[PDB]
Structure 1
Amino acid sequence: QHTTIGDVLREHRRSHPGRTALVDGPVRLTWPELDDRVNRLAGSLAASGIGRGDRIMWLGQNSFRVYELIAAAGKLGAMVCVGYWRWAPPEMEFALRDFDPHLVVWQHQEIHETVARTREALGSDDTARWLRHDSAPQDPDGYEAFLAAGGLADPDLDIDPDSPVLVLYTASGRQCGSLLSHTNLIAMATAAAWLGDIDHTTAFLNSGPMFHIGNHQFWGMPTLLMAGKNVIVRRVVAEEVRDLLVAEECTHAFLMPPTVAEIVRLNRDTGHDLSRLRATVAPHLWEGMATTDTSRFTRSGAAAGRGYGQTELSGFAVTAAYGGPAAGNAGRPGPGLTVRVLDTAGRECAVGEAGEICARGTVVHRGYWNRDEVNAHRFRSGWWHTTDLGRREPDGSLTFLGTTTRMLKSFPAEVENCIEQHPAVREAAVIAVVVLEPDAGVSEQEIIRIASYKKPKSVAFAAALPRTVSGARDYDALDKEYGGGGYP
């Protein structure tokens, strides 16, 4: 009987009878209050037929209710998919038909237009109960009234913690729902508690999106595991965030640089105490208004990106924080993971040789929802295949080179990377389009470590790279411009 998420809540209610667990605007909950609510919720779920292996889709922004649902589903051996709130109806429809939830918890604010249309496209296939979460607390088709109708008795079920409990859709087109078990999350949060020096006094601002692994690992689940206080913001607004930092005495946040600079300018000279916040990302941009984190997470450079990982490995499973100075850009595996770089023929690559990053261990997810064939192939031979490219340095460390999905017939990323190991190059795209540093300047011929055949026969130069509306690299934009066709 291994520890489940349910056990974690049942222990914190007895061990921390008066400490704040969740805060969400006006709502505040101690661990007892939360466990009672999770028990009510789990009562009404078991009432509506939800049990082992059943499925729930959250369709909204960040909410304290996400944590509650996860716990309740966990206590029944069910799973919650925290879906993408910005999905247009085609994608939203796809996920619904894919994940096939028995119940859909949804948000009116912001997306009701899209939600409404999508249900109409589903028509008579929409055999799921929908509860509005941001409803008036009386609403009969409402979350709060769904929960209140349940009783306080913990269902006390013997749940296999290897059963999935959190499903994250991972984003070459098609989206797939990664199955993260109770064990995946607890193994992740214990690792993370060591990286961050996280404890019961940790107050963490959930300003990162819960539809994605980032916010969960740093630091949602570890804060939760160690009994810290998780504070929820629906949206990131610099003023409100800055305000919560003071009010909840927050020690950690999930903040991106543009937000931070917004808080800095805005807080300057007003004298509010932001010194309790341990800043992880880009410490200098705070100027000193907050305290520079000295946990291994920041010290090592993992906070700035020194690491490798993915949703399917419960997030950031390899960092410069495990094992010390590393020549490679990602560091080494933390505990609960073993990695090997494998070539085409499934054999271990030699030191320096590039291949696919493959993993086994406790942090490796359970597979994708409803992807039998992709799972069989990705789990071949008792290794999870990440589809990412890497190599081992002689010092032991690992280097993340890029993806293996983008391919050229006899890998681009491998050379994209080699090219970006020129001081004059800022970034490169190989199909070899090149964006140079503003100050440097170098010959196409100097550009042209790798093998006789792998080098391209041409190098264009751009002011920057094309990019999608999300801001990620846009390749099919410049497959056109520079002659890109014939792809295997």
Structure 2
Amino acid sequence: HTTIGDVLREHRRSHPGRTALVDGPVRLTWPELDDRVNRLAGSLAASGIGRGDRIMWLGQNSFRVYELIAAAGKLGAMVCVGYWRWAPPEMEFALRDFDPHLVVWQHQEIHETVARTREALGSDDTARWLRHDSAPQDPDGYEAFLAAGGLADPDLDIDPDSPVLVLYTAAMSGRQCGSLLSHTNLIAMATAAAWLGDIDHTTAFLNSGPMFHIGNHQFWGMPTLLMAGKNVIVRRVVAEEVRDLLVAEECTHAFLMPPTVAEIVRLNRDTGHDLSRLRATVAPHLWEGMATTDTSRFTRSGAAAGRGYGQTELSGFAVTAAYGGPAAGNAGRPGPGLTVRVLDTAGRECAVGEAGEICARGTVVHRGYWNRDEVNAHRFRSGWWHTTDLGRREPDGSLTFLGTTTRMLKSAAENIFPAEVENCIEQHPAVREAAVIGVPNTRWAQDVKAVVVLEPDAGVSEQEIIDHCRPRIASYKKPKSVAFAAALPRTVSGARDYDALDKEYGGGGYPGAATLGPGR
């Protein structure tokens, strides 16, 4: 069975002259990339990394993320792409939970957060640390570490069901879980995406989405890699730099949400820079004729506007309106390599039209979460992965995604789980309880809002509650407003009544049948 390592082994032979990666001045053909991967694998193995061992990336997007995944993959090891946006306590939690043998970290932009995180681990910090964006000769730097390795391919027999990429998600408990994506997961996801988006060796994809998110890997980093196209890296999304890279690298695809598109168009207008090679998937109307609207099924089906269903744990958008033709349901049908059933609370399959939990089996279902044996045993019960999302089958057999069962928010293209924010706010000594909801954002999706019950005789303002979150959770997770109450609404059972909180405090816009996709 094919592994990620085999993809690079074949491309170095079949596409010796083609450029595989561009990241600033760095440009690598398939053979140059595979050589670097082999040296890197050499040094990892010399550091004691082998099957089932673990590397953490703490940085923005880099070509080195692809090198590390491939190198680790050739050893049967796995790479966690941590989020550069995480606050120190989140980064510390991920480091302790994942327990990596190696941490590859970035100084630019996040040095302070990285330092505070390392400091906090104290003597529990057993990992080796390499700075990726170091001076070339830095002996604790990635490039020197890589250079010391030998050119030979490790040539190991790696089982492609081995986890190779780990993406933290699913923080419904207040703490994130690391989704284990195997070589086979990624290859099956990439294969389906190649049909969905008509990807081939001429594809040139700008990696302008966060590598912490499954979306950038699915659309279209991994299919581009699989088909031997060019992956162009950008560290962060800055409209001008994106525009220049679209032109300079003749990109055919990019991961760009509607606000960024509008910034690029405004900036490019009447400058004569030709963006016509770009196949616009998201908000194609905003490009004003500067791009070519994508003709692939991804865009024509409505999948690019949110007509589909998935999650990290299914290797991304695994159900779409592109599979199986016209769909009465909002999400369409499963791609090949996944089967789906909507199950009631007793684990019996729901009838047509009846809401239940979306469950799945097949090649794109992940291996489970890192270090969560009981969660895995429970969410895989009866041999089906339980998504925690609600859906139904329509009479035409298509699927409708109705909403979450976890009160998850989406805000500014991030997921926010209420318990992460609630736990943070409740750490405050003045706060007895906090409930977090989402309210409609003026453009798309939600803003975070907290409803707070103060301790008796304590007093703290809305702004103090918000600012309290700054050192503790990612910036995008903070409430944008806070309401105060003497008590939170309760159901008959004494559970928090989140429906009543939404009704009384302006909640709405949650992911589901009324709010699908990236917006406009």
Instruction: State the TM-score, normalized to the length of structure 1.
Output: 0.85
Partners of 2:161 and 2:184 within 8 A in 1 = yes
SS in 2 for 1:134: coil
- C-alpha change, 1:85 and 1:443, in structure 2 (3 Å) is closer
Deviations 1:358-416 (A, max 9, x none): 00000000000000110000000100000100000000100001112349999999999
Whole-angstrom CA distance in 2 between matches of 1:326 and 1:440: 55
The alpha carbon displacement at 1:272 in A equals 1.1
Range with bigger deviation, 421-430 or 246-255:
421-430
Range with bigger deviation, 181-190 or 165-174:
165-174
Partners of 1:401 and 1:413 within 8 A in 2 = no
Partners of 2:86 and 2:474 within 8 A in 1 = no
Range with bigger deviation, 450-459 or 206-215:
450-459
Deviations 1:39-98 (A, max 9, x none): 000000000000000000000000000000000000000000000111111111100000
Determine which structure has greater relative contact order: mean sequence separation of CA pairs < 8 Å that are 6+ residues apart, divided by chain length. Answer: 2
Whole-angstrom CA distance in 2 between matches of 1:356 and 1:19: 45
Question: What is aligned with 2:406?
Answer: 405
Whole-angstrom CA distance in 1 between matches of 2:103 and 2:32: 24
The alpha carbon displacement at 1:476 in A equals 10
Whole-angstrom CA distance in 2 between matches of 1:461 and 1:221: 46
Report 1:379-398 matches (<5 A).
Answer: 379-398=380-399
Range with bigger deviation, 335-344 or 471-480:
471-480
Structure 1, unaligned runs of 5 or more:
none
- C-alpha change, 1:32 and 1:466, in structure 2 (3 Å) is farther
- C-alpha change, 1:466 and 1:233, in structure 2 (3 Å) is farther
Whole-angstrom CA distance in 1 between matches of 2:256 and 2:493: 18
The alpha carbon displacement at 1:120 in A equals 1.1
- C-alpha change, 1:269 and 1:407, in structure 2 (3 Å) is closer
Deviations 1:173-197 (A, max 9, x none): 2200000000000000000000000
Deviations 1:116-137 (A, max 9, x none): 1111110111000000000001
Deviations 1:116-170 (A, max 9, x none): 1111110111000000000001100000000000000000000000000000001
- C-alpha change, 1:454 and 1:305, in structure 2 (3 Å) is closer
Range with bigger deviation, 261-270 or 161-170:
261-270
Question: What is aligned with 2:257?
Answer: 256
Whole-angstrom CA distance in 2 between matches of 1:55 and 1:453: 28
The alpha carbon displacement at 1:265 in A equals 1.2
Q: How many residues align?
A: 486
Range with bigger deviation, 439-448 or 225-234:
439-448
- C-alpha change, 1:353 and 1:458, in structure 2 (3 Å) is farther
Whole-angstrom CA distance in 1 between matches of 2:423 and 2:93: 34
Question: What is aligned with 1:486?
Answer: 509
Range with bigger deviation, 16-25 or 172-181:
172-181
Partners of 2:167 and 2:213 within 8 A in 1 = yes
Whole-angstrom CA distance in 2 between matches of 1:470 and 1:144: 58
- C-alpha change, 1:362 and 1:468, in structure 2 (3 Å) is farther
The alpha carbon displacement at 1:254 in A equals 0.2
Whole-angstrom CA distance in 1 between matches of 2:40 and 2:496: 42
Partners of 2:426 and 2:433 within 8 A in 1 = yes
Partners of 2:89 and 2:473 within 8 A in 1 = no
**Residues 1:30 and 2:29 aligned together:** yes
- C-alpha change, 1:475 and 1:84, in structure 2 (3 Å) is farther
- C-alpha change, 1:15 and 1:285, in structure 2 (3 Å) is same
- C-alpha change, 1:93 and 1:181, in structure 2 (3 Å) is same
Deviations 1:440-464 (A, max 9, x none): 9999999999999999999999999
Report 1:204-283 matches (<5 A).
Answer: 204-283=205-284
SS in 1 for 2:349: coil
Deviations 1:459-485 (A, max 9, x none): 999999999999999969946955999
Whole-angstrom CA distance in 2 between matches of 1:421 and 1:377: 30
Partners of 1:17 and 1:32 within 8 A in 2 = yes
Whole-angstrom CA distance in 2 between matches of 1:439 and 1:243: 57
Deviations 1:196-254 (A, max 9, x none): 00000000000000011000000000000000000000011111110011110000000
Deviations 1:276-302 (A, max 9, x none): 000000111001011010000000000
SS in 2 for 1:409: strand
Whole-angstrom CA distance in 2 between matches of 1:407 and 1:231: 32
Range with bigger deviation, 114-123 or 330-339:
114-123
Whole-angstrom CA distance in 2 between matches of 1:380 and 1:399: 23
The alpha carbon displacement at 1:263 in A equals 1.0
Whole-angstrom CA distance in 2 between matches of 1:407 and 1:170: 11
Whole-angstrom CA distance in 2 between matches of 1:77 and 1:34: 18
The alpha carbon displacement at 1:6 in A equals 0.3
- C-alpha change, 1:378 and 1:218, in structure 2 (3 Å) is same
Q: What value does the CA root-mean-square deviation take over the aligned residues? A: 10.1
Partners of 2:431 and 2:453 within 8 A in 1 = yes
Whole-angstrom CA distance in 1 between matches of 2:494 and 2:276: 32
- C-alpha change, 1:442 and 1:282, in structure 2 (3 Å) is farther
SS in 1 for 2:56: strand
- C-alpha change, 1:178 and 1:414, in structure 2 (3 Å) is closer
SS in 2 for 1:235: coil
Whole-angstrom CA distance in 1 between matches of 2:419 and 2:490: 17
Whole-angstrom CA distance in 2 between matches of 1:426 and 1:275: 56
- C-alpha change, 1:438 and 1:3, in structure 2 (3 Å) is farther
**Residues 1:174 and 2:175 aligned together:** yes
Range with bigger deviation, 285-294 or 408-417:
408-417
Range with bigger deviation, 455-464 or 111-120:
455-464
The alpha carbon displacement at 1:428 in A equals 21
SS in 2 for 1:105: strand
Report 1:31-70 matches (<5 A).
Answer: 31-70=30-69
The alpha carbon displacement at 1:260 in A equals 0.7
Instruction: State the TM-score, normalized to the length of structure 2.
Output: 0.80
- C-alpha change, 1:293 and 1:346, in structure 2 (3 Å) is same
Report 1:301-380 matches (<5 A).
Answer: 301-380=302-381
The alpha carbon displacement at 1:271 in A equals 1.1
- C-alpha change, 1:350 and 1:31, in structure 2 (3 Å) is same
Whole-angstrom CA distance in 2 between matches of 1:269 and 1:86: 35
Percent of pairs with identical residues: 100
The alpha carbon displacement at 1:7 in A equals 0.4
- C-alpha change, 1:144 and 1:482, in structure 2 (3 Å) is closer
Partners of 2:87 and 2:473 within 8 A in 1 = no
- C-alpha change, 1:467 and 1:213, in structure 2 (3 Å) is farther
Range with bigger deviation, 35-44 or 85-94:
85-94
Deviations 1:308-327 (A, max 9, x none): 00000000000000011101
Partners of 1:257 and 1:281 within 8 A in 2 = yes
Range with bigger deviation, 350-359 or 439-448:
439-448
Whole-angstrom CA distance in 2 between matches of 1:298 and 1:91: 36
Whole-angstrom CA distance in 2 between matches of 1:140 and 1:11: 32
